[model samples]
Target: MLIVPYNLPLPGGVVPRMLITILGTVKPNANRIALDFQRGNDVAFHFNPRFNENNRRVIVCNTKLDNNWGREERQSVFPFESGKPFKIQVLVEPDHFKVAVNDAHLLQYNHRVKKLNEISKLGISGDIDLTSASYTMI
Candidate 1:
């Protein structure tokens, strides 16, 4: 698993923001998945191997805000493998933020920042082998 700490810049200085835990593959001809935890919601995604055989992938986004309900959103492309490698990035913008994989796939999670001008924080954890994973505030 991979863990990254970010300094949430707000009124009180810095606080722990969000934690991203991935529990699947990023290898070629495989499924891509990830999980996210913000204070309230915990979301996850898994690409179907069968659906991916036809080069069509599925994206599932589950949230606690929906009364702990589960939902599924599908993507046309499957971007995952065991040894192929991929990356996840959390971009904290002013109005809304986004979490993305391979720069092509992304999921937007609503924010609960105390201050609009507060700088957000980020943390990441996973089980896949990251050939080169890195993060930055932009």
Candidate 2:
């Protein structure tokens, strides 16, 4: 689990569209995985998949700003499995963030923080072994 800074500039620090790709494997007996987009002291996006929370099925999406958590978006259909390799692609749009798992569309999270340029960091945590994580302007 490591929190790494996104080194690429968003084309004048404001991205119209962006794509984040992550490849990792869930650890054995994994409980959760979290991906975060951070800017300064605020987290613009919090993507969490709780494997053991709520009977081993739940993907909770939310944001944290000024030390406060936003409303939770709990949705069904988790495509991750323990001890299995997975690929996640997150597409950043002006209005929302779209997520895909293993090439399958998973969910879309509406932008809570409007400035896309503020997202300068990407962090990953929980019981996962990441092979690669990269971002591109699209």
Candidate 3:
């Protein structure tokens, strides 16, 4: 299992059609978890799922530039649970990031940063035990 707040390089960087996979289990009584695609100091994408906000489970997606975050896109369909395993995929399409949870299509966030390859890192944090986090760039 991966230590909390893990960071890893995106081998070959990000490209159209690349698939980023994260396998993990949410901690018992989990409050939230964050998965980010980063380019140096900026966050190209931030995918966060919150389980305890007003007892409303919502997935917040955003982009950060100049150390500031954009408005959040709150997705309401929750596909995860506390103390359960999950396999999440972020598929890089030509214009957007297509996200899937447990092989089910979830949401798409359009490219906020124009240069996809410049997003060279992946980060995972918060209440989850990460099994693996990797990307297939082809």
Candidate 4:
């Protein structure tokens, strides 16, 4: 069983034309879950799907720099379902990251950190059971 609040190192760090794939199942009683692309104490990308935040289901994307969180980017797309599986693919580009769910384009978040290689870790947490998290050169 995959544990919650998992952290996986990004081998060779991040770069353009790289893809990060995450497979997981959301729990039935989940309130929210977080996936972070990080560089040391700063976060380049923060992907959060909150199931019951303020009585709404929303996807929140943002960045954290210098120990402060950036502006929240919220979306109404709710492809995630409780007790169901999901495939999240994050494609790294020169200026931004393209996120796809189940092979379909979902959203894009611009780079907050200037250097891509500095973002060397994947941080996972909250109420989901992870199946696998891996990366590939694209």
**Candidate 4 structure quality by residue, lDDT tens digits, 1-138:** 577688889876799989999999999978998999999999899999999988999999999998999899888888888898999999999989999998889898888788888899999988889999888997
Error of 2 at 61 (Å): 0.4
**After superposition, which runs of candidate 1 have C-alpha atoms over 4 Å from their true positions?**
1-32, 40-56, 105-127, 130-135
- Encode model 3's per-residue lDDT on 1-119: one tens digit a residue: 98879998986568998998999999999999999899888999999999988979999999999999998988999999999999999999999999999999999999988888899
Q: Each candidate's lDDT (Cα)?
A: 0.40, 0.80, 0.92, 0.90
How does residue 102 of candidate 1 score in lDDT? Answer: 67
- Candidate 2 residues 31-110, lDDT tens each? 88888877766777788999877576899999999999989998799999999999999998778889999999999999
lDDT of 3: 0.92
What shift in Å separates residue 92 of candidate 4 from its native position after superposition?
0.4
Ranking by TM-score: 3, 4, 2, 1
TM-score for candidate 4: 0.95
Q: Give the per-residue Cα lDDT of candidate 4 at 86.
A: 92
lDDT of 1 at 135: 39
Better of 1 and 2 by lDDT: 2
- Report the number of the highest-TM-score candidate: 3
TM-score of each: 0.46, 0.88, 0.96, 0.95
Question: Model 4 scores what on Cα lDDT?
Answer: 0.90
Residue-level lDDT for 122 in candidate 4: 93
| Cα distance off (Å), candidate 3, residue 14 | 0.7
